[PDB]
Amino acid sequence: QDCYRGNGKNYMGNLSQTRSGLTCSMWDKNMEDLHRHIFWEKLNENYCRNPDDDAHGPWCYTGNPLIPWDYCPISRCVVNGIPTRTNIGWMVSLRYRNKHICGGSLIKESWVLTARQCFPSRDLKDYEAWLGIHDVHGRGDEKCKQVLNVSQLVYGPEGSDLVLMKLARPAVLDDFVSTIDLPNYGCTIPEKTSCSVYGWGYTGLINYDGLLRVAHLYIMGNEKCSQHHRGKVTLNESEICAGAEKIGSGPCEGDYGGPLVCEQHKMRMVLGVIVPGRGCAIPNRPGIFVRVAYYAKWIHKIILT
Amino acid sequence: KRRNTIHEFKKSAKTTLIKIDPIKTKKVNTADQCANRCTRNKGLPFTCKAFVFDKARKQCLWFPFNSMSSGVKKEFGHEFDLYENKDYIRNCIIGKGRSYKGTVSITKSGIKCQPWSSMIPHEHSFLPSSYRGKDLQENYCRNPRGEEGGPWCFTSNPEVRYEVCDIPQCSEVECMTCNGESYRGLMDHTESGKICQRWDHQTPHRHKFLPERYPDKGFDDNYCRNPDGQPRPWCYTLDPHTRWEYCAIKTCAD
Amino acid sequence: CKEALAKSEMNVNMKYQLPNFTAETPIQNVILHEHHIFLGATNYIYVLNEEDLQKVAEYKTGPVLEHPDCFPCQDCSSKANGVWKDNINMALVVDTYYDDQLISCGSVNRGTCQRHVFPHNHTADIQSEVHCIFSPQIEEPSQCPDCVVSALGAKVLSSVKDRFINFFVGNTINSSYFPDHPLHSISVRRLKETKDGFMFLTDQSYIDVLPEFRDSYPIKYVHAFESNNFIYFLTVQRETLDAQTFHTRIIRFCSINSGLHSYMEMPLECILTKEVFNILQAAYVSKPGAQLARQIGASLNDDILFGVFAQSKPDSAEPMDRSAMCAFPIKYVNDFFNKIVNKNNVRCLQHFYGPNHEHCFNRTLLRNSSGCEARRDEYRTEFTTALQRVDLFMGQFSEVLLTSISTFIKGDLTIANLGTSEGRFMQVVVSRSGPSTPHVNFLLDSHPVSPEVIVEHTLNQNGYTLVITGKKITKIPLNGLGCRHFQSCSQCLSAPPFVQCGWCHDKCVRSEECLSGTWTQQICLPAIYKVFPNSAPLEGGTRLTICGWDFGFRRNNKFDLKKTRVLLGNESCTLTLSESTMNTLKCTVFNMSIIISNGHGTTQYSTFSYVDPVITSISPKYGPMAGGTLLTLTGNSRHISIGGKTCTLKSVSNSILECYTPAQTISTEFAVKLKIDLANRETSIFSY
């Protein structure tokens, strides 16, 4: 019941129930804690109108520790790749009943970034993450293999197809295992910028020994992908589209939750998540991802938990 | 045409009603006319369940609301003479009771009545527009067909479609002391199923008694009494054929 | 003379030339897509252009060798040892999320499904490129993620959730089929994005009837559709595992690919009034017209479920050929799921949980407080208090079986494309307000109408409805297939205005053809077929039957028989209500013209007689008294007697008369008096 006002203050929301199912708490203690914590710059007691005028819109506080706050639900307005010669740290191998299902990105010492599509079950007694691996089964190496349980799942905004999962315990960070930074809030990529995907997936090989496979790529404008897709894509703000030039090579099954990492200026940085769409690896057809930039702030607010 | 209804109406004089938070007036000589205007089907664009006459102002005003509603104020304006419709205040059945308008929304087995506006849970409920005038209100149970079984309603309870509200006669709380003239009651039901003649009016059958000349013997509305102490109560009839008839009342004890 | 004037009733059987396409084999499913209309049929798939139904192209999934060891989509033509079975398509869907493809889903070949790809320049050429969808399940070969569709009966619904093509499929299962190769009663399939298989995302994602109730308790699904983030299903099945008696059921769950999470069955029934109709025959989901919106209380934009029920042969599934159609505003049924049914109407679900097993000893239902949050202890619930509806036609179809239905809107009215068991295709302006007579009731074909129909509605003024009967696919313009068939003025004026035509003095006709300019659609003249009798004595006010039509005044549905009167000369004959119908009159009153006045107009008819009776001659004159002889009379509804005893008329005429004489114990002669409802002039004496 909201349109054209993504800013909280414009919407006096008369509702008291979050996305998950937990009722909002007494706003005043939250105002104390937030004024201590959040530094944006008298809003109602215990109604999910968001004070902070956040990008994603109205949101509410919850008492429970594991979920301090969440949105109250309202309407609003790799195939043909190369093996990697060297061990890599951002890669997170997600393991479901003791086999790989998706790749993920390592953000902090206890936090990984993946896609909603990759969580068939919500259960955590079964998921198990590995870090620091060169072979999808680990037969290649084990020194850098880090086995961790999964502590908790946090879903993105509605319509995000984006998810974070937080670990039972932290990890030791060394050369073998590495994290990656995040974009600036509006960090907008130059057109024709080169950057690559790393994947663990189907790869279109009669046999794949289990090396993680790298595929280069170039960012294209949303307009160019509208042309190639012939109106089959209705492009929204949050997506990016980067497409292989003159060759059909792209991520496919198993690569969901994979990172689009790109080098901006001097260092390399993540920009996207590999998510399924539009088909697989069609020659002279681009690829479509979700831009972390539209959600980086939300990542920050949640990572403050 | 010219037909009488005012037997059905309820009379209280030297009084007035106002609901300050809201009525049509026309130049009428007799309260009898405005009353018929009310009673007759679709007589007036608004559903008048009351009206007041004053012979002095030569004007009549009609209320689509009785004193039973909230927001009504009762005052001693002596020239004004009220007119209610006892059908709503009845809290009785009368035979089939086709013209039952009372505000009972509960059934014999005690499950709520479905509103006649809402199609859930039962659907044979289109009647609010099907039958104009039968005063089928929000929820209260009526007899829109004048079906014999009694005023029935649809239950919110999904299993049972319709169940008939049990609702009393007027007779069950009415007794008669052996003389009857001592009994000062509320019935208007003869033995032949006819309604009494108005005492104050003398039309069509012309009778000797007027309430003003014999006050405190309660010749009010059309209430079968014993004006001269007959064993059981009686009145003159509206009916052009029969002059006068008794009224059958059971007896009480203790 | 009601029979003779039955020519007033519309010609139920008139023949129409409509674009009619025929196939070699029965047609099961049909899909409309991008100016082509594909058909699946026994051993075949066809593609059609619309406006002509020219078979532009075809692709041949003919008979297949079924041999136990031959794998499904490996090629075993070389095998010489084992039967040339045939396939019948049961699921034909179109996908365009991935690429413009068609998916067919065969019967015999283990129920493994295949794809056809549309080239960019030319779309009809489906034969050029074909794959199979077969993934050897190396991990867990024990289960089939790719053995999709059963044989006995199935419904398949495609959807795109989460950038994910999901097939929600229901199967009918015979006990014999399982141990060879498993199946499932209701299941959720992800298509692998590389388009070479399906995966079961979780053991939780399917529901199969427990091993013991396979042979008993068969469920056959009849419709499947999506709305409001829920995927409903409509099926038919036993009231209880040992009830050996049936009703329709509805299935609800939301559309998380992980599995069927909030799985709720409810009984659905439509009654008449309290006679119930158990079995559903077909259904169609549509939006309602303005008129019906209030009349069932639904908003103009809400989805609506139309279902035609047939009453069953008791303790059996076979329809009894007594039917109804009933409307279920989806908000109401969804509400029933959420709020109306109280706690202890709910139960566990028999066929899956098994009647005796731990959970439904006790479980709280987060039924109101939660709407399909994917929990761990999801509870599949079987309700017991059927959602009761009442008929929309008030049982005007109480004797004829309905088999296929569709609905579109038009103006404010809403129309139903009904179809019966013997191949008649009606169209009715449906409203609870008035019993409305079909404005098209032609016979289509000998075979029953298939439930699979398509309606396409271009620019709200040009549309059409493909319907399938036996081996025939036909295009019907919904715009009013005609109005030539109407012959009774009242019928001409009742036909809904969207078909522009009106009466011109002799027959319902399109406006711009008949020249007389008498073409009218609002007021029209009563008409008389005949009168019986036309011979009336001066004193005889005798029963005159009047055969005609349009004898009623008009009210859009209710035909007002009270604005009628009869004028004879100057006096008015005595018109009697209970025997006066828009069909006929029954009145009781020198050739004279009778005039009949109605609330619209009046009819003159030129020949009624106040004939003056004449009797002149009698036979015999002198004879015996035995009372067994034959009298003959002559001159110009009567009776005749002598001495209080009626002589039976041995012969009747205007100019000849014959009685058999009463026996009278007397030997003299009597003047015999005619009693033609009245003692008219007696004759003379005859010697007994």
Numbering used by the authors:
A (entry chain D): 389 to 429, 434 to 469, 495 to 722
B (entry chain A): 34 to 55, 59 to 290
C (entry chain E): 26 to 106, 110 to 301, 311 to 626, 634 to 680, 687 to 738
What do the study's own words say?
C-MET can be activated by its cognate ligand—hepatocyte growth factor (HGF).
Nevertheless, c-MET II and its bound HGFs, which include N, K1, and K2 domains of HGF I and K4 and SPH domains of HGF II, adopt nearly identical conformation as shown in holo-complex. In addition, hydrophobic residues from HGF I-K1, such as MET155, Ile156, Pro157, and Pro194, pack tightly against residues Gly334, Tyr369, Phe373, and Ile377 in c-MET II-SEMA. After proteolysis cleavage, the newly formed C-terminus of c-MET α-chain inserts into a small pocket in HGF I-K1, which is mainly stabilized by the electrostatic interaction between Glu302 of c-MET and Arg197 of HGF. Intriguingly, the residues of c-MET II-SEMA that are involved in the binding to HGF I-K1 largely overlap with those at the c-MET I-SEMA/HGF I-K3 interface, suggesting that c-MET-SEMA cannot simultaneously bind to HGF-K1 and K3. In consistent with the results of the cell-based activity assay, our in vitro pull-down assay results showed that the HGF E159R mutant exhibited significantly lower binding affinity to the c-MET, as compared with wild-type HGF.
